Amino acid sequence: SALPELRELIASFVSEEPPEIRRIRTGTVPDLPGSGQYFTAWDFSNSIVRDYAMNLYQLTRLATDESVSVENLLTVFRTLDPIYSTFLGYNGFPVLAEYAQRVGQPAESRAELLDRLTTFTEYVNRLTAWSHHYFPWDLGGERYRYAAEEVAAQAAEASVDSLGDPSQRIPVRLTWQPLGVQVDAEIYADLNPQLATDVLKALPFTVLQDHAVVSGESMYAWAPLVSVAPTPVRERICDAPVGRLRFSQATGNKVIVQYGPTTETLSSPVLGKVVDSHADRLAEVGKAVWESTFSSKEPVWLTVERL
Amino acid sequence: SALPELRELIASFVSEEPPEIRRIRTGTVPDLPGSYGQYFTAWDFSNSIVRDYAMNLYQLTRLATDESVSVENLLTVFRTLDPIYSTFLGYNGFPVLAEYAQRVGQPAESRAELLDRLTTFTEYVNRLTAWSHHYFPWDLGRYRYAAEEVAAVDSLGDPSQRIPVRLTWQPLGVQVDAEIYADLNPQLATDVLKALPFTVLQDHAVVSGESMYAWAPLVSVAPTPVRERICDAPVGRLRFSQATGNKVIVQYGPTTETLSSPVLGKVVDSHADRLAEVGKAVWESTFSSKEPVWLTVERL
Numbered sequence A: 001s002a003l004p005e006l007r008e009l010i011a012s013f014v015s016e017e018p019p020e021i022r023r024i025r026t027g028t029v030p031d032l033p034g035s036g037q038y039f040t041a042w043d044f045s046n047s048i049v050r051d052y053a054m055n056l057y058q059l060t061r062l063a064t065d066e067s068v069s070v071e072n073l074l075t076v077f078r079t080l081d082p083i084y085s086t087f088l089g090y091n092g093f094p095v096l097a098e099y100a101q102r103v104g105q106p107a108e109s110r111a112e113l114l115d116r117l118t119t120f121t122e123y124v125n126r127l128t129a130w131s132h133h134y135f136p137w138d139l140g141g142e143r144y145r146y147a148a149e150e151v152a153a154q155a156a157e158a159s160v161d162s163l164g165d166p167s168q169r170i171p172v173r174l175t176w177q178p179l180g181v182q183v184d185a186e187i188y189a190d191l192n193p194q195l196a197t198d199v200l201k202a203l204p205f206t207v208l209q210d211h212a213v214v215s216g217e218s219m220y221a222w223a224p225l226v227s228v229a230p231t232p233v234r235e236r237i238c239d240a241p242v243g244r245l246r247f248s249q250a251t252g253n254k255v256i257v258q259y260g261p262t263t264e265t266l267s268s269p270v271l272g273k274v275v276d277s278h279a280d281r282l283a284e285v286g287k288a289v290w291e292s293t294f295s296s297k298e299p300v301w302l303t304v305e306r307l
Numbered sequence B: 001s002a003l004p005e006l007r008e009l010i011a012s013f014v015s016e017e018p019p020e021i022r023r024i025r026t027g028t029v030p031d032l033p034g035s036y037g038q039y040f041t042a043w044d045f046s047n048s049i050v051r052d053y054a055m056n057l058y059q060l061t062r063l064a065t066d067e068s069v070s071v072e073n074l075l076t077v078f079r080t081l082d083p084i085y086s087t088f089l090g091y092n093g094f095p096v097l098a099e100y101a102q103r104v105g106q107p108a109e110s111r112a113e114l115l116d117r118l119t120t121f122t123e124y125v126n127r128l129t130a131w132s133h134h135y136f137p138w139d140l141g142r143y144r145y146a147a148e149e150v151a152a153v154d155s156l157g158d159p160s161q162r163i164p165v166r167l168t169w170q171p172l173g174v175q176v177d178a179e180i181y182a183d184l185n186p187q188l189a190t191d192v193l194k195a196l197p198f199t200v201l202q203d204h205a206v207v208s209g210e211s212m213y214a215w216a217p218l219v220s221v222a223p224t225p226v227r228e229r230i231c232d233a234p235v236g237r238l239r240f241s242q243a244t245g246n247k248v249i250v251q252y253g254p255t256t257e258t259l260s261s262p263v264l265g266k267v268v269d270s271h272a273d274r275l276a277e278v279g280k281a282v283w284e285s286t287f288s289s290k291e292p293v294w295l296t297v298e299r300l
């Protein structure tokens, strides 16, 4: 591989909290940053590793585009990257800074560059998944509320499950521990073929389950993969039914179970759906995952398995 | 300019808070972003993305001046990196920036046309980011360091290219005089001088330490052969990082950021005593009060 030790980190951090995050969230970052508080530095570390994960994923994706010369991709990299890597090194992620330098070093094949890009992205995606689990979203929870009536009102202001072929549905089970909850889901292999491929290849796995903090009632967890598969079928998130399983290679590789009303209007690649029989089981897990992500940080693990 | 409707807003928003910024700060975004009836998380996201979005727009703009990178190869990179950022920014209370992102991506009939849209747009986004930094509720972070643990170039160049200028903070009433080193980063200094005079909101660093900065009205890709580690900077140092958006940075004490920063000039030693008093009111402005403070920079 291009960076085998990186892969060792990517493996460890599936089950385990990366040290960076632990020193970040307890204001123990050696450089003691943040103009006698650290929240602002912490906020920065979180948001910027998130956006760097996106950046990198689009560089990874660009790398599949042979109209852009490998050298042009590397040039683009050396330009856009340092402002992110150097700052992240300063603010809690110094290993990432050195590895970012490594990814840029003069490479000799597209495949090699691309292998670095996919590797690095996976690493940063996991740093981002942990960073997301631990950020104090509860802060504006007594300070800044949407008022109930306006909310129900905008809910009042406003098929892709019928496309393709039922014969090609591939079954799987989602298991949420320690809740001991379980549903059986179907994956539309026919809709986004290499997408669902990339997702079933990874199976099984056990990752951490967290909650959306913008779009509404939408759980997502960061799967151990990077897919650049076509996404011909995408569905707007506000139009998603309850129980929809959407992937989002754009934003890491999040297995996004949607269980309740969401407001986001950006389109999302369709993976599958929970079997109607088990959709009602979702509200509970969704509330407990809101609790963990918003509040308690009590980890809730996902296991996805090929039935 | 390739986008005049954009130029007019670039002007207005130096003086007036962008409706978007306020709408998000008050959580009035029609799409009610934020899970479970609160908009702090959405507020954070919008601010965070719009800030790093500008960073990406700037590095793109620098790539647009790079003649090895093809204009079409650039269009391709743009059309790849831009959507995941701009379309969410369109969902989180910035529909206009999302409409303009697409216009920026349309096929450029020249490299200058494309460099131009990127300049006007980078600046528009840098101004939205300026106000968002000003209004984000940093005081909400409760997350304080331990007291014990917190406890725990001007010579170089030519004295005839020291261009005098005056920085006046309002309502601070403090008007320090200063010299810009027109000879250390000529291209950058020239860029800075052609914007004088301006009057933009003065805001404080939130991660760096005792340093202030204000989004100037310019987009410079000018080389910066003379830089100094932020940590090693004298009180009264003027620096200018266009990488994170052009900001006139005034350092008024010790900092801990170890990145290097373009050397723009210095406040004269005499007036440096006045910087401390204006650092505090600015910190309390950004962190707590949000009460505006306006920096005017003009040439004497």
Ligand SMILES: N[C@@H](Cc1c[nH]c2ccccc12)C(=O)O
Pocket: A050, A132, A211, A212, A213, A214, A215, A216, A251, A264, B045, B088
């Ligand atoms: N809709 C997402 C916002 C988002 C966009 N890109 C992301 C990447 C990682 C995490 C969250 C996001 C949310 O509610 O959280």
Ligand SMILES: N[C@@H](Cc1c[nH]c2ccccc12)C(=O)O
Pocket: A044, A087, B051, B133, B205, B206, B207, B208, B209, B244, B245, B257
């Ligand atoms: N050092 C900066 C952090 C930063 C990086 N990029 C930025 C862009 C805009 C504002 C701030 C930043 C600070 O203390 O704030």
